[PDB]
Design a protein around this ligand. Sequence first.
Ligand code: PLP
Ligand code: PLP
Ligand code: MN
Ligand code: MN
Lengths: 322, 321
Amino acid sequence: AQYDISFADVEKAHLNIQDSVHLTPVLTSSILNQIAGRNLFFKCELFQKTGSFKIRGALNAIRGLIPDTLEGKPKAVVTHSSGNHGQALTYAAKLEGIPAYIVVPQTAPNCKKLAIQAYGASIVYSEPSDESRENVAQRIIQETEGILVHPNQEPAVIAGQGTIALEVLNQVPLVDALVVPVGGGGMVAGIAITIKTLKPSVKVYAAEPSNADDCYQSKLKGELTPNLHPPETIADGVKSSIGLNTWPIIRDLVDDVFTVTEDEIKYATQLVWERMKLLIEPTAGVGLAAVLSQHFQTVSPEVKNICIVLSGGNVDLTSLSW
Amino acid sequence: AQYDISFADVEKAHLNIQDSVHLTPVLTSSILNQIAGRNLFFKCELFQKTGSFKIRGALNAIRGLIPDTLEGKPKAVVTHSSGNHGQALTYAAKLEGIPAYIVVPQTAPNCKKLAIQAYGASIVYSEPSDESRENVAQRIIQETEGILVHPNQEPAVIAGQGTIALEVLNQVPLVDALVVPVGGGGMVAGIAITIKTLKPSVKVYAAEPSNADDCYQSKLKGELTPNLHPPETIADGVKSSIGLNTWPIIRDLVDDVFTVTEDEIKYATQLVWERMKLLIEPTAGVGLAAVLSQHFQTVSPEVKNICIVLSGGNVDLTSLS
Ligand SMILES: *Cc1c(COP(=O)(O)O)cnc(C)c1O
Ligand SMILES: *Cc1c(COP(=O)(O)O)cnc(C)c1O
Ligand SMILES: [Mn+2]
Ligand SMILES: [Mn+2]
């Protein structure tokens, strides 16, 4: 029973990040409660700094490096990202006063790149040729003597994410289950370690697009089974597969994985928009879709109080489904 | 000096409705503060039951006007107003165990008729004659022994709306001004009465589309001056002109009216969506638009803490600008 993080790592992460992240509210909806047949509690990480929960893990993995003086601090951080991870890493870098660089091609949206240097990180353009971006990033690191930061599930990132569960437990002490969207698995793994240490009777459920169901298949097969090919889904925040760092935790401490169709993600996201007035991105609708899915009916009526993590609000408004 | 509601009406409204309405939170945005150059406080009535503040006035209208015996309670409610008022009134009627009727023009959109049925009101049809409408209304009123509940001119409705300001004063103790979207003027009138009673040093500003600028024009001219023609604006919640009951209060107790273009409303609404992740309807973006407008730069630098009323979140997600 060895995992990359412990409960202690999550408590330390809490102390490390508390002054720089929002302790986000839990909101409720009577009408959503009646549709689900459960008492629903929405943990509002869409209100978090940068528009998603990411900042938690990213700040803990950047701030928890300085030994004391200005000798073991990163000279610079370099990334490709562009999405929610990019926004998180960059903001974390600004807070710590670390020069930050983002390598992007002419494919990312205007709103996203405006919100990527919205935290003052130098934008370097590489020609849209995939492997062309690797050489430019290596050149930045050469000049700065800094570090490359790619989308990660390092211990410090998982522990930072676990802090969501610490707040949920204080905000809804009678919670019977947490429902968490799953991509690389960092969020659900951190929550799982936290929840199962403090209150082992509370359920931890993963929510996953069926078009990107590596986590579901992994649990089924009993071994790490990453996506065959880059999945196509509106839930763009959960496209990456679970990894070596999150698999053991997901295998043992996540009670079940609930898959949801593209239509179910769309309906659920629209439902939150219309009844709760919360501008969640479709990835954050996955959790509600899981709670409303046919398969979730197998879950006990005793599991009445359910916390859904609304993981982000970074919607690309220039694009629409319905 | 003497108006259709008093401060006492507002306090009674609070007692009337407090067990059944949300005390909605005040949210802040540091990036919005930097854009505006002032400290902004967003009263989140979009989180209110039915998706707008109007539940406050609608419910107070039912619970207020009562001959105080077991034999003396409204037996039904009626309105010509569909949209936010119709939805709020129906919801309040259900709370009270009472039927609600919306007088609907027979040529109204299919989708609006379905939405009215969906939230539990009986539709009664009329001609768009503005003479047969009140004819059908008064016919229902007599049939049902019910009361007509106007969206903005009814005293009990105005009083209910003012309870917003009670919460704002408790939630933002150092508030310097409230910025309130104005349509019929029920909300701004109720808020003005409340603010000018409890802390008159606090400014009350009305925010209005220039495409529907009757409140601005009325204040300028010094008399009630309705919109000449139906307003053409994305702020669908504030198309109504101010009326006989709201004008006197606005005249004396509203400090100024700030007008905003359609592009300013659209941009400020998008700003709230993108920066705050709050799905406000464009009508609710009117207040922020006012704060960001060039004319608002004339407002004294002392007026630093500004509460903007995010009045509603009932946006039709089938059409984007
Ligand atoms: C990154 C992300 C996730 C998934 O979290 P993992 O830890 O990667 O599983 C879910 N939702 C949103 C909005 C995200 O940005
Ligand atoms: C009706 C309405 C208004 C205007 O209120 P009045 O009391 O008519 O001035 C503002 N915002 C929203 C969301 C509304 O529904
Ligand atoms: Mn997956
Ligand atoms: Mn007007």
